[PDB]
Design a protein around this ligand. Sequence first.
Ligand SMILES: Cc1cc2nc3c(=O)[nH]c(=O)nc-3n(C[C@H](O)[C@H](O)[C@H](O)COP(=O)(O)O)c2cc1C
Ligand code: SF4
Ligand code: FES
Lengths: 212, 429, 87
Amino acid sequence: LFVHRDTPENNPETPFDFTPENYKRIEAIVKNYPEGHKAAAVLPVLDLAQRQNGWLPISAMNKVAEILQVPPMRVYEVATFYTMYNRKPVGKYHIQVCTTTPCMLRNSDSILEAIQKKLGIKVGETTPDKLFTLIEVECLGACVNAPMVQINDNYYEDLTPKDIEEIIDELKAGKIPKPGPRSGRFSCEPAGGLTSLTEPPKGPGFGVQAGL
Amino acid sequence: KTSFGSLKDEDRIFTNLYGRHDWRLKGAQSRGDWYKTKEILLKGPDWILGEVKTSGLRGRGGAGFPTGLKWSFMNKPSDGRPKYLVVNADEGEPGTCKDREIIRHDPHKLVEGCLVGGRAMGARAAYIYIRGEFYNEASNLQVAIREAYEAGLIGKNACGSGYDFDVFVVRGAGAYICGEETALIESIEGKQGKPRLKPPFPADVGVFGCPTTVANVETVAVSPTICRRGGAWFASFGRERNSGTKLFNISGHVNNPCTVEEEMSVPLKELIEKHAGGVTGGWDNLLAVIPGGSSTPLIPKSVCETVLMDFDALIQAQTGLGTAAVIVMDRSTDIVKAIARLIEFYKHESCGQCTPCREGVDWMNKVMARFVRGDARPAEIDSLWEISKQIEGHTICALGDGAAWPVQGLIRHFRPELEERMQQFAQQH
Amino acid sequence: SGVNNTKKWKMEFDTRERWENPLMGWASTADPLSNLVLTFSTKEDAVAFAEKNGWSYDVEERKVPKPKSKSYGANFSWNKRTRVSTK
Ligand SMILES: Cc1cc2nc3c(=O)[nH]c(=O)nc-3n(C[C@H](O)[C@H](O)[C@H](O)COP(=O)(O)O)c2cc1C
Ligand code: SF4
Ligand code: FES
């Protein structure tokens, strides 16, 4: 929903303030923009509150409005426009499965159902332990590595039902699995052998025209 | 020349595309980056704009405007306002992941491009807008920028050239529409990512209200090489008015989905077979290809037999080069469902600002969802065509066109499939 | 926003008493001119008509909206207050 209703857990009196170290980070954010245009810092600072707090209560939105001297409504507009802001609490690991056509064509559905069975939840829900939250997202910009998921800040790619269940098993154990493809390649090169960039790259000055 | 493709590694620009060599400053310099940057800067903006003009380079962000002419809009006297370069790293087009490889594996190409391109425009700084999901890539770029600052390649007296230049990185927060040039500017300003009407054009009133040029990551990252090796060297690739090398993404129903650099005007068939290992199940198993990302209309196998991958060739085939993100669908695909999911994507991504896309795309999505099940009558096909034409060319920004076009491609080339599905539903009910 | 009902000159008369009908509560009137409203191309035509019919009259000069200076670009001013905080 894109309207707010005060609750005991989410209301203007809910405690939130940036830590002393995050205030230092805020100063560097605000210094990135011309003077007289502090409102440009709304997105990075709002994201900073989420990284500290995990999600965005209304009191966190109010604090950002105060620090940057912007009307709170303009901050509410940003919080509700960009989908990476969590206006409700999310589990420790926010699993985000891409289901757009390129990933769908390479069986993102088998990934989605594998997660649902293993965690016993439905898309949109949080586990009772509050460790995992599962949602579908649009193209995450790793289409040649489909099917893939993002968990918090990391991408996990070239997934199969076995691979994702192994990633979730590692997460449940406190281990932090390595990101990237799980199929054998390292990034976006074709499997079965490079079809380009096999020879060593040229060095400084190669092919440089005259006059420089 | 009359045949294109088979680009040699000596002529490839992004030589660390696969990240098998050091992506940091030392590896970049060993590969030719940051070489004679001072000389290029001291040549002057008009010389730099001349080389980009002669190179025939066109925008790699999806619209394909001639880059040299576009960048020359900033080559004008100052008026007290600062001038900015905004590098578009939102990379949100479904099927497109080329800009991701440049940022994380060749970051110093992009940083040097910002300085060289910024110098041509007389900008004081560059803001690189990178989508918020590319966290690890943004951090990689941030590390490279610090090395450039420490080495004195950017910042005060960049490359000892007497020209100051800052490179800032700002992350998005989840919005495909923030790849649109004016929506990107609005997002940097702390507002909802809603596009601006034009005029004014960004070269007159842009970010913070100042003269601005928005350029795609790949467009920027190739400019330093064009200056070093010459625009003529770049124009010796691809057909006339389709110059240069191009980064391709081949995904979907291929054997080895991959990113690769190849000559412009390469045949679509040759690209899929040489680099992606061919269509899954053989070329005979091909059904349709989306050649330039979800915003470009699909083309059937018959068209894919001989078409060339460049701006002009794909326009004559009733589509476009777009981002050159090739999405391949074999004959096991439910083509109506594939397209219906793209319309669902545009429904989730429309900013909602202007009426035809706010309401039209959601309307098209509802009709397509029924077309998937066959729960419609054939008269609704011509209705859906007309609706898509009421969105196209009537919206503020090109997202509305980007949603209309995929629907048009489906109806143009697969009307029998849509009608067959309605016939099957009717007998079952 | 339509301006098509502001093209012509009108002539109406002074409002007189309306009272509640004792039976039904309907609005009764004894003013035969209560509904009379004439239309004229110009105020000269209206004045001419009023003069020959012996009615005393007041003429109010037509109010036309004054031309405004509009600029979409001002929504994003670098240093002026016209910059919009939202779209
Ligand atoms: C909905 C939409 C999304 C877009 N996304 C991107 C993008 O992710 N990256 C990009 O470079 N251009 C994107 N564009 C194109 C930009 O608006 C603009 O044309 C481009 O940044 C100009 O740079 P170029 O001339 O070098 O291509 C998008 C356009 C639209 C309408
Ligand atoms: S076409 Fe869609 S995305 Fe573009 S301005 Fe209109 S509503 Fe927003
Ligand atoms: S379609 Fe899933 S990452 Fe692009």
